């Protein structure tokens, strides 16, 4: 089996930079009659994938030609000279070869300054109260980068289940992303607690941010 | 001119199989390898297998040979794929790609894809709750919605009808046991809310559904 090993599989870039995605394959993908058949492919979100560069490094007609392939051993490397806003997206590389395998994906994307998540924490509503629910909902928005960690806890005591988290992709205005937690619990188990926490811990303080509130209001 | 069309939007019970269709146009069916290509809810390109119509050839990756169908029919210029005993990594979107020959002998054409959803989830309205900030007592308000218990995507959710879009964060739907649950977070100056009616304007059209809930205190 030949594996496409593709690096990085994130790589934030600032507009206007050069950027290099590479890939390698875990032997000699050089075809018999002397040909390697490895190909680059973009995917836009919402679209299908596209073909970019074929045959190692030959651009595919009306390829933006800050695109440019090349590529040896095993070492396969795409570069973006001048990163624009239409290049964002993941990359593929492919040898439609003997068995045809697909690289793993490098997610192009903007590089910010590192920024704190702001937290906001949601009592569950009445009405969904009523239908015998209770969901206490925790936005962690705008931050960066996008590695970020919520626990939940009730009484002080954490509660690791019926946690639904759900990220947004880069922000197109302020290279941010956002996270959105949610414990759903039952009514009465609900209305059996006091303290409602969510701790968000991000790559910029090593102090969890902390968010919570009492039925006591 | 050519152009690859694919089958629509299929919701499929688990346990089952999905046939799906990608009629060709503007070249020689007959003369080109068409390949079939999956990606999951999640995740990158898996290159599934290739039929070469008009000797019906095929080549599948162990991994899906007993689960993908690969089939041609010539005078209907539509290959075909049965995806069988359907499970939840089924779920995923598929993409029927053509291998040109001379020029580029790469994945040149694509199409729009087609998406499988393996559910045994019946068509249910959402359930849409006010996110009110805590009790009484900054310079911006977050407030937000919350969507949840639907059956199938997509809901499309709009703050003030659209007034509102700088500052409102729409995360992406996730799957909690059979049903889909979508929240948004909308950020406001505080002389704005509740100064000013804030309406969150849910619609989900496979129920024919389109609700409104505002943002009180």
């Known amino acids: 089996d030949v594996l496409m090993t593709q690096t990085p599989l994130s790589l934030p870039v600032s507009l206007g930079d050069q950027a290099s995605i590479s890939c390698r394959s875990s032997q000699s993908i050089v075809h018999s009659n002397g040909n390697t058949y490895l190909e680059w492919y973009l995917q836009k979100p919402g679209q299908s994938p596209k073909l970019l560069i074929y045959?190692?490094?030959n651009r595919f007609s009306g390829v933006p030609d800050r695109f440019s392939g090349s590529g040896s051993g095993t070492d396969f490397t795409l570069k973006i000279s001048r990163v624009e806003a239409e290049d964002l997206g993941v990359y593929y590389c492919?040898?439609?070869?003997?068995?045809?395998?697909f690289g793993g994906g490098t997610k192009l994307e903007i590089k910010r300054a590192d920024a704190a998540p702001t937290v906001s924490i949601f009592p569950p509503s009445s009405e969904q109260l009523t239908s015998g629910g209770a969901s206490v909902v925790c936005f962690l928005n705008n931050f960066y980068p996008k590695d970020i960690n919520v626990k939940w806890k009730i009484d002080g005591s954490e509660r690791q289940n019926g946690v639904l988290n759900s990220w947004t992709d880069q922000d197109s205005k302020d290279s941010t992303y956002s996270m959105s937690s949610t414990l759903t619990l039952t009514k009465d188990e609900y209305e059996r607690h006091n303290s409602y926490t969510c701790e968000a811990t991000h790559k910029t303080s090593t102090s969890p941010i902390v968010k919570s509130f009492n039925r006591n209001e | 001119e050519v152009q690859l069309q694919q089958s629509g939007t299929v919701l499929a019970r688990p346990g089952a199989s999905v046939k799906m269709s990608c009629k060709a146009s503007?070249?020689?069916?007959?003369?080109?390898?068409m390949h079939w290509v999956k990606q999951r809810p999640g995740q990158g390109l898996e290159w599934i297998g290739t039929?070469?119509?008009?000797?019906?050839?095929?080549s599948y990756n162990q991994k899906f040979k007993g689960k993908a169908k690969l089939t041609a029919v010539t005078s209907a210029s539509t290959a075909y794929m049965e995806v069988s005993s359907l499970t939840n990594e089924d779920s995923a979107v598929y993409y029927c790609?053509?291998?040109?020959?001379?020029?580029?002998?790469?994945?040149?054409?694509w199409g729009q894809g087609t998406s499988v959803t393996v559910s045994s989830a019946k068509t249910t309205a959402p359930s849409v709750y006010p996110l009110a900030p805590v009790c009484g007592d900054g310079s911006s308000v977050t407030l937000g919605c919350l969507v949840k218990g639907y059956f199938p995507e997509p809901v499309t959710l709009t703050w003030n009808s659209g007034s509102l879009s700088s500052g409102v964060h729409t995360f992406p739907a996730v799957l909690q046991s059979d049903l889909y649950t979508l929240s948004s977070s909308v950020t406001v100056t505080s002389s704005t809310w509740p100064s000013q009616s804030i309406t969150c304007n849910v619609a989900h059209p496979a129920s024919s559904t389109k609700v409104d809930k505002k943002i009180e205190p």
């Open positions: 492919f040898q439609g070869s003997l068995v045809p395998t």
């Open positions: 503007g070249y020689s069916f007959t003369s080109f390898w």
């Open positions: 045959k190692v490094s």
């Open positions: 790609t053509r291998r040109s020959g001379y020029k580029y002998y790469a994945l040149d054409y």
């Open positions: 039929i070469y119509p008009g000797n019906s050839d095929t």
